[PDB]
Amino acid sequence: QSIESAFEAANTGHPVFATVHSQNCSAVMRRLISRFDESVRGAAIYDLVETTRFIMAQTLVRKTDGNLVAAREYLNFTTDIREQLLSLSDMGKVASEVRRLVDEFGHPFSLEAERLHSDGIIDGHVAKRLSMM
Amino acid sequence: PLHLPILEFKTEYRYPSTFEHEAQFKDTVLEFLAHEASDIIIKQGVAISAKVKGTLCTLSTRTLNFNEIERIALWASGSSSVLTELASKKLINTRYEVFHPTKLTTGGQKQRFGYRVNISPVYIQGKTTAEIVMRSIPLDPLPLADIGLSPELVNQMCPDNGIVMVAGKTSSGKSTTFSSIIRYIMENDTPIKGHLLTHEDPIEFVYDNIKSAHSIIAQSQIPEQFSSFAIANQEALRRTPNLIMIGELRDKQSIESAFEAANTGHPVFATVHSQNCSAVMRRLISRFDESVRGAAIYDLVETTRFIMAQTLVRKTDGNLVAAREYLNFTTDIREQLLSLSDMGKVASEVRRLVDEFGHPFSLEAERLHSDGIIDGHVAKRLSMM
Amino acid sequence: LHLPILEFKTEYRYPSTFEHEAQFKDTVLEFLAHEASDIIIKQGVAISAKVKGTLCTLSTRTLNFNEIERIALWASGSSSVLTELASKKLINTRYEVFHPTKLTTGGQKQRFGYRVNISPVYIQGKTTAEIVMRSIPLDPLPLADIGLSPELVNQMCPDNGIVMVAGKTSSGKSTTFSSIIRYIMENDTPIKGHLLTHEDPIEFVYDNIKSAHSIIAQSQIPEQFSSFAIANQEALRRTPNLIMIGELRDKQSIESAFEAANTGHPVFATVHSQNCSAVMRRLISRFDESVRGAAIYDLVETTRFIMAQTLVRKTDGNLVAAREYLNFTTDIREQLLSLSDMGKVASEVRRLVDEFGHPFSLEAERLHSDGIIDGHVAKRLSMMS
């Protein structure tokens, strides 16, 4: 019911900011879809792709200092990306696709870990942990 | 000085030093109303602001203290226990009418503006207050020329049967479009005449002051008179309607019900939350499982007579115009979509068909921009959809 | 001065203000002189009726919410109906008007029968009722008129078990069942004796059906029994040879059907379902998983015959009933029982209707070959239902 209310607020023309307890963007999509039964699950996937504009996953990792930094995956849902997500003939794959697309067009946790690691903000170990997210 | 919301110059009033009385408050309200206000917001933290031209304007830099907002709150609520109720966690929505003395109607008596007033818990500088919000309530259906529609086009939108859909993100534009179309229906000789039911969320528009030779309208409120929209339609079948404003098509059951209504005798006006006509098609089709999806596409193509997506774009001038893309589902179009082989290309092909025979968003932006109304960039965005 | 059309009067002068029921019945009779089919009473406007589809009235004068109160009292079974309206109760009943001037029947008198919706509306800030009465056929229709073969309906009248006709609300299941009962008691059929019908709105009456072997009692279900559950509990207390129950809509209705059938009665049920498989699946879904096995067994064992039916418009422009049906024989039923998985029953039933029944595809083929439906219509029938 929360996810549906977010849908309606979005489609009634309003920015909706929402928090999700998932590890990463793929996990966000999959988790959101899990809420909806198979009978409604097509409609739900279409609503979710059509209304989503942007997905950020965050985690806290240890800086070389010992302080924490927020590493972020994000995918930005351009009209291109959403058009691509809709046209996968099987929607069981949507989540997977998102991953792919995040990898191709977004800022995956691997890329963020490379980026922190190049700036020396992060060790190799937590870099590896973080890419694995 | 500090960053501030915009203040338009006042009309017929000097700003109150402090909000002492409901007549002061009302005078502020109709000053706002001169600066045509979509909505008006009272919060203690900031000066009174209203949504003029879909932006936030404030009349003075002065910021109301909590007692001001308490008084205003008790005026608009009409209940002293308001914050008492707010701790009781009862949600407080009511109506607040303000009458502008000098203005009067075509006939009528005394000019009235309704507001829907929600009073909602907020939390600020460490504790609970109320925020008040007054949404202006549309007065009467606007003439079609007034809202940018030609009598011809709406003639297209007034079939003997089937489904006319208007599509958009915001409810205001749909309510306005369909209310205008219904007033035009009542006032003119048109294929669809007789009993007109509308199943509205907030009954936005009223038809008390629309003269009809041939037609009657019955309006029913969203939650409170009819619990469901399903309930309201199922009962609608019992009401010998000559046109059914169904409300939004959302779930499989809503659009199957719409199919039902159309496939008896009488027109159905539906709104859809999608950006353009192709998007309308694709979205409605989404509601249906693979196995049922063929039958569903057949029903959708055969029942549909006309699809309008509208948006609001900002003209160079400093105002908001409705951009409309529309396709009329004439028998040729319907046959062409039925003549498809995949039948899953119906969305694409509907796009193509809007390009060929409809009014695409690109053409609408080209015509708007060709005239003074919109700049090249907003025209670009408009064509993009 | 703009007005809907008003009739030339036959017999009576319009009341200054509606007070007595006899004025209202007289008005209905005036409308009937003009062969008026439906009547809308609403607050803003004069009492109107649809003559040949077009709205009309007996006077320019509008009605006060008071006389809409009165009229609502008269047409509806219940008293003080507005509180029932604010209780989100759906108020459909039936209303009868006997002809004053000794218009008599083939027998002794002549009566006119009305399906009365009362619906909540919103007028000028206030909740109201709109009333709509649709003249409805009084006597069940012969099989030939609704296109049923005596052989098939004999197929569908067991000594025991459940006969279901499924369909959309606007598909005239009630008509089918009324025809089937009239034929039941007019002909020599396996089912004879005391037949009870429980009808929300009672539509058809059997007062003019002479039977050699059977008596029929009809009970209206809001007004005479508070609930369907109560009426079915009471039905067994009586000595029924056939119980036309309600829609099978929730667990309790389905269970009442189970009880009636298992105490050795034909049970006639409607289901809100597009096809037979869909009927089975829907009924099974009503039960929790813990009880759903038992419920499935009961369902297959008590079912004797399943009809889904649609009204499809035919080449002429009029509409006829397409019917898919399966007869549940001992062999069919036991074959539904003897599955590795019972959750598959629905699927199976699909299969079975294709194999042993009259599927929608076959029905569309045979309608189309005899040139009843246009080919598009046949395709739609085959696609799903």
Numbering used by the authors:
A (entry chain E): 255 to 387
B (entry chain D): 3 to 387
C (entry chain C): 4 to 388
Q: What did the original publication write about this model?
A:
The dot/icm T4bS system of L. pneumophila is powered by two ATPases: The membrane protein DotL, which is part of the coupling sub‐complex responsible for the recruitment of substrates and their delivery to the secretion channel and DotB, potentially involved in complex assembly and secretion. DotBL and DotBY subunits display a very similar topology. A DotBL or Y subunit is composed of a ∼150 aminoacids long N‐terminal domain (NTD), comprising 6 β‐strands and 3 α‐helices, and a ∼250 aminoacids C‐terminal domain (CTD) consisting of 7 β‐strands and 10 α‐helices [Fig. 1(A,B)]. The main part of the CTD adopts a RecA fold and harbours the signature motifs of the AAA+ family: The Walker A motif between β7 and α5 (also referred as P‐loop), the Asp Box on β8, the Walker B motif on β10 and the His Box on β11.
Homologs of the dot/icm system are found in most Legionella species, but also in other pathogens, such as Coxiella burnetii responsible for Q‐fever, or Yersinia pseudotuberculosis strain IP31758, responsible for the Far East Scarlet‐like fever. The DotBY hexamer differs from the DotBL hexamer in exhibiting an ααβααβ arrangement instead of the αβαβαβ arrangement observed in DotBL. In DotBY, A, B, D, and E are in the α conformation, while C and F are in the β one, yielding an overall twofold symmetry. The DotBY protein was crystallized without any phosphate or nucleotide in the buffer. Nevertheless, when analyzing the ATP‐binding site region of all six subunits, we observed a striking difference between chains adopting the α and β conformations [Fig. 4(F)]. Surprisingly, in the α conformation of DotBy (chains A, B, D, and E), this α‐helical turn is present, formed with the carboxyl groups of residues Ser173 and Ser174 (equivalent to Ser159 and Gly160 in DotBL) contacting the NH groups of Ser177 and Thr178 respectively. Interestingly, in the structures of PilT, PilT2, PilB, EpsE, and VirB11, this additional α‐helical turn of the P‐loop is not observed.
